XYZ file of C-alpha atoms in Angstrom:
330
model
C 30.203 65.738 -88.648
C 27.371 66.987 -86.442
C 24.982 69.912 -86.242
C 22.998 71.494 -83.433
C 20.355 74.200 -83.777
C 17.878 75.819 -81.431
C 14.194 75.573 -82.309
C 11.816 78.244 -80.999
C 8.011 78.296 -80.638
C 6.386 80.745 -83.028
C 3.842 81.931 -80.441
C 2.740 81.548 -76.822
C 0.820 78.336 -77.607
C 3.672 76.391 -79.265
C 1.596 76.265 -82.452
C 4.785 75.418 -84.374
C 8.562 75.691 -83.999
C 11.062 77.511 -86.211
C 14.758 76.737 -86.665
C 17.247 79.019 -88.447
C 18.743 77.577 -91.631
C 21.549 79.055 -93.743
C 20.970 78.819 -97.519
C 23.352 79.936 -100.246
C 26.556 81.948 -100.516
C 26.729 84.413 -98.821
C 24.368 82.786 -96.343
C 20.706 83.762 -96.385
C 19.163 82.760 -93.046
C 15.522 81.665 -93.103
C 13.465 80.311 -90.199
C 12.073 76.951 -91.288
C 9.534 74.580 -89.773
C 11.325 71.231 -89.362
C 8.687 68.657 -90.310
C 9.250 64.929 -89.720
C 5.924 64.329 -91.530
C 7.017 65.565 -94.971
C 10.048 65.410 -97.213
C 10.358 68.736 -99.078
C 12.650 71.627 -98.167
C 10.799 74.625 -99.602
C 11.121 78.348 -99.014
C 9.438 81.651 -99.610
C 11.551 83.237 -102.330
C 12.043 86.071 -104.799
C 9.828 83.961 -107.099
C 6.833 83.813 -104.733
C 3.790 85.733 -105.993
C 4.203 89.104 -104.302
C 0.631 89.274 -102.975
C 1.238 85.956 -101.166
C 4.265 87.255 -99.209
C 3.423 89.085 -95.951
C 6.436 89.525 -93.677
C 8.381 86.330 -94.392
C 12.087 86.348 -95.131
C 12.693 85.242 -98.729
C 15.451 83.274 -100.432
C 16.802 85.056 -103.507
C 18.716 82.497 -105.613
C 20.113 85.164 -107.952
C 22.111 86.531 -104.995
C 23.682 83.142 -104.176
C 26.873 82.298 -106.053
C 26.305 78.582 -105.328
C 22.671 78.411 -106.493
C 21.925 76.454 -109.665
C 18.529 76.012 -111.292
C 17.557 72.327 -111.333
C 16.384 72.496 -114.909
C 12.846 71.252 -115.521
C 12.147 70.351 -111.906
C 8.879 71.380 -110.261
C 7.218 70.570 -106.965
C 3.743 70.763 -105.480
C 2.655 69.662 -102.024
C -0.553 69.608 -100.007
C -0.519 69.142 -96.237
C -2.934 67.407 -93.895
C -4.354 70.765 -92.809
C -5.398 71.699 -96.359
C -2.551 74.141 -96.993
C -0.331 73.867 -100.052
C 2.563 75.351 -101.994
C 4.352 74.790 -105.295
C 7.167 76.082 -107.472
C 10.525 75.286 -109.089
C 13.821 74.002 -107.697
C 17.400 75.127 -107.172
C 20.340 73.276 -105.699
C 22.381 75.235 -103.166
C 24.442 74.902 -100.019
C 22.331 74.480 -96.881
C 23.624 74.522 -93.305
C 21.797 73.697 -90.052
C 23.530 74.356 -86.768
C 26.995 74.059 -88.305
C 26.249 70.983 -90.468
C 26.589 71.714 -94.199
C 25.127 69.913 -97.226
C 26.192 71.006 -100.689
C 23.869 70.392 -103.604
C 20.697 70.326 -101.494
C 17.423 70.685 -103.380
C 15.920 74.002 -102.257
C 12.355 74.168 -103.547
C 11.433 77.753 -104.359
C 7.773 78.656 -103.911
C 6.001 80.370 -106.759
C 2.629 79.927 -104.986
C 1.636 79.393 -101.361
C -1.819 79.013 -99.867
C -3.394 81.582 -97.577
C -2.386 80.021 -94.248
C 1.296 80.231 -95.230
C 0.951 83.887 -96.243
C -0.854 84.625 -92.995
C 1.928 83.150 -90.857
C 4.711 85.715 -91.031
C 7.005 83.692 -88.747
C 7.491 80.594 -90.960
C 9.728 81.163 -93.983
C 9.363 77.602 -95.282
C 9.560 73.932 -94.356
C 12.438 71.500 -93.932
C 11.128 67.971 -94.421
C 12.599 65.146 -92.351
C 10.378 62.193 -93.320
C 11.694 59.640 -95.824
C 12.782 60.858 -99.250
C 10.235 58.592 -100.967
C 7.649 61.300 -100.118
C 9.549 64.141 -101.804
C 7.339 65.791 -104.427
C 9.953 67.027 -106.915
C 9.244 65.946 -110.490
C 10.495 64.455 -112.742
C 13.512 63.607 -110.547
C 12.679 63.057 -106.887
C 15.092 64.766 -104.478
C 16.602 63.779 -101.124
C 15.936 65.386 -97.754
C 18.591 67.359 -95.899
C 19.030 64.437 -93.471
C 19.335 61.891 -96.291
C 22.005 64.020 -97.968
C 23.905 64.571 -94.698
C 23.607 61.048 -93.296
C 26.785 59.492 -94.684
C 28.869 62.352 -93.264
C 27.299 62.291 -89.803
C 29.105 60.724 -86.865
C 25.993 58.581 -86.346
C 23.052 58.379 -88.799
C 20.531 60.033 -86.481
C 18.817 63.272 -85.629
C 17.029 64.169 -82.397
C 14.066 66.401 -81.588
C 13.968 68.025 -78.131
C 11.006 70.403 -78.313
C 10.276 72.760 -75.441
C 7.005 73.493 -73.680
C 6.559 77.260 -73.968
C 10.347 77.457 -74.379
C 13.075 76.864 -76.979
C 14.479 73.408 -77.656
C 17.013 71.710 -79.901
C 17.427 69.713 -83.096
C 20.700 67.756 -83.190
C 22.137 65.923 -86.195
C 24.672 63.125 -85.953
C 24.830 62.597 -82.177
C 22.739 61.874 -79.088
C 23.200 64.404 -76.264
C 23.198 62.148 -73.210
C 22.701 65.197 -70.949
C 19.391 66.100 -72.600
C 17.210 63.340 -71.130
C 16.627 61.347 -67.954
C 16.714 57.593 -67.604
C 17.224 55.517 -70.745
C 16.033 55.811 -74.345
C 13.507 53.145 -75.347
C 13.720 52.248 -79.026
C 10.769 50.958 -81.024
C 10.278 49.639 -84.552
C 9.463 51.877 -87.516
C 7.625 51.111 -90.745
C 8.739 53.217 -93.705
C 6.049 51.803 -96.022
C 4.071 55.077 -96.068
C 7.187 57.282 -96.015
C 6.687 58.382 -92.388
C 8.327 57.690 -89.038
C 5.493 55.271 -88.314
C 5.511 53.262 -85.087
C 3.132 51.491 -82.681
C 2.508 52.806 -79.189
C 1.729 50.139 -76.598
C -1.147 51.977 -74.891
C -2.199 54.928 -72.803
C -3.382 56.224 -69.450
C -5.455 59.277 -68.486
C -4.263 61.154 -65.409
C -3.616 58.800 -62.515
C -5.720 56.096 -64.166
C -4.613 52.582 -64.931
C -2.677 51.968 -68.114
C -4.644 50.451 -70.999
C -2.535 48.088 -73.103
C -3.553 48.550 -76.742
C -1.626 48.985 -79.977
C -1.858 52.479 -81.496
C -0.150 52.844 -84.881
C 0.832 56.412 -85.683
C 3.496 58.782 -86.925
C 6.033 60.949 -85.108
C 5.337 64.313 -86.770
C 7.102 67.450 -85.558
C 5.152 69.457 -88.158
C 1.751 68.722 -86.580
C 0.839 70.756 -83.502
C -1.564 68.419 -81.686
C -1.913 64.767 -80.691
C -4.431 62.944 -82.908
C -5.580 59.555 -81.598
C -8.507 57.144 -82.058
C -11.909 58.450 -81.038
C -12.195 55.880 -78.238
C -8.966 57.103 -76.618
C -9.804 60.783 -77.061
C -13.291 60.304 -75.555
C -11.786 58.552 -72.536
C -9.444 61.510 -72.021
C -11.999 64.315 -72.295
C -14.558 62.443 -70.187
C -12.245 63.267 -67.272
C -12.645 67.038 -67.812
C -15.884 68.552 -66.502
C -17.719 70.343 -69.287
C -15.508 69.164 -72.139
C -17.299 68.322 -75.366
C -16.704 67.775 -79.051
C -17.900 70.829 -80.979
C -18.654 70.350 -84.666
C -18.746 74.128 -85.148
C -15.308 74.667 -83.616
C -13.882 71.487 -85.151
C -12.901 69.349 -82.175
C -12.910 68.960 -78.433
C -13.195 72.133 -76.380
C -13.178 72.513 -72.621
C -13.781 75.222 -70.020
C -10.750 77.475 -69.771
C -11.189 77.295 -65.956
C -10.308 73.578 -65.977
C -7.134 71.953 -64.734
C -6.372 69.237 -67.288
C -5.223 65.695 -66.448
C -2.002 64.324 -67.836
C -1.944 61.801 -70.684
C 0.537 58.909 -70.776
C 1.517 56.974 -73.895
C 3.457 53.720 -74.055
C 6.747 53.143 -75.864
C 7.394 49.452 -75.425
C 7.423 48.904 -71.676
C 8.295 52.578 -71.074
C 5.907 55.462 -70.492
C 5.961 59.105 -71.611
C 3.813 61.456 -69.507
C 2.335 64.553 -71.181
C 1.488 67.060 -68.404
C -2.052 68.413 -68.482
C -0.883 71.959 -69.184
C 0.616 70.792 -72.486
C -2.935 69.909 -73.681
C -4.300 73.486 -73.255
C -4.367 75.435 -76.543
C -6.174 78.432 -75.141
C -9.361 80.288 -76.039
C -11.087 79.283 -79.263
C -11.347 83.010 -80.095
C -9.940 86.001 -78.282
C -11.638 86.474 -74.920
C -13.632 83.242 -75.029
C -13.877 81.017 -71.964
C -13.992 77.937 -74.197
C -10.508 76.531 -74.759
C -9.243 74.259 -77.499
C -7.972 70.804 -76.616
C -4.539 69.505 -77.524
C -5.709 65.894 -77.928
C -8.125 65.422 -80.833
C -9.647 62.552 -82.779
C -7.803 61.127 -85.783
C -11.032 59.614 -87.122
C -11.137 61.977 -90.114
C -7.413 61.710 -90.940
C -6.738 58.041 -91.659
C -3.666 57.928 -89.398
C -2.848 58.680 -85.786
C -0.408 61.558 -85.346
C 2.016 61.976 -82.440
C 2.498 65.686 -83.025
C 4.209 68.325 -80.923
C 1.918 67.866 -77.891
C 3.295 64.341 -77.518
C 6.820 64.824 -78.828
C 7.619 67.853 -76.615
C 7.143 65.639 -73.551
C 10.082 63.480 -74.709
C 13.597 63.438 -76.093
C 13.043 61.764 -79.471
C 15.658 59.948 -81.546
C 15.031 59.563 -85.266
C 17.442 56.727 -86.037
C 18.215 56.540 -89.744
C 20.292 53.377 -89.599
C 19.791 50.798 -92.351
C 16.736 49.626 -90.428
C 15.292 52.884 -89.027
C 13.904 53.018 -85.492
C 12.526 55.648 -83.110
C 13.742 56.282 -79.571
C 11.891 58.012 -76.739
C 13.207 59.160 -73.362
C 11.688 61.230 -70.608
C 13.382 64.551 -69.880
């Protein structure tokens, strides 16, 4: 089997991407944030505290003839941005782009933190990291991809995120028309539960490539590119007037600037992030200070190849017995 679904930016800055997902019988369609940095499929629901729901579409398990309470199971997750959610668990039928999994754990939110409530466009998350990170207790549950894998034509999914435009998540096949050149594959460590890999270096603009190992994760659920402070300083030093602002919380730059590209290495191959992809717009409405799309990972503990990086590439998440990642230009 295969599946193919369009993913759409939630706003004009590509702050996140939403993909429609069918849950239950009859189908209830919710727009979920596909997140290769976590491993829980959770939704706003009829059980979510009413004051914490503000415009999201909810899953109502009582209206699904295939929903079953997973008795005793609870979940609770906290994300790298400080947001969180928790609740109980149902199993139900879940379909993405024509690919159907029966018996998928659908984690129903009883509580969500303020940033989830405030984002009316995201109805939940669909985790695509390794199932060892799934938070369900006392019986850990499998991700949608893990449940689907055996049925897929090939044990892979691909992320093709757009810049200021829709893109595609495919399951079970590699669309050879969706990229240019060849796909360069690189090793993955699953020891922390992430799609963790090692970039071979970077360049800023037309500058010479610096060969240096940068361990990090491919995370579709993180907006920006988080890299070591040395690398980030070298980038922003090329932008007149750019500075790290403790009050804003990262590097800012004059909105009048034209930004240089940033290149990252995948083995001997190179992925070029155009400068425009690094512009996240005014820090507050009407400001002439703009927020940078490349930020320091120093306070995280891990480098994160988020959407800024991934949207410049066609990315293969290869879930073969030994997982690997593939990157192609597009």
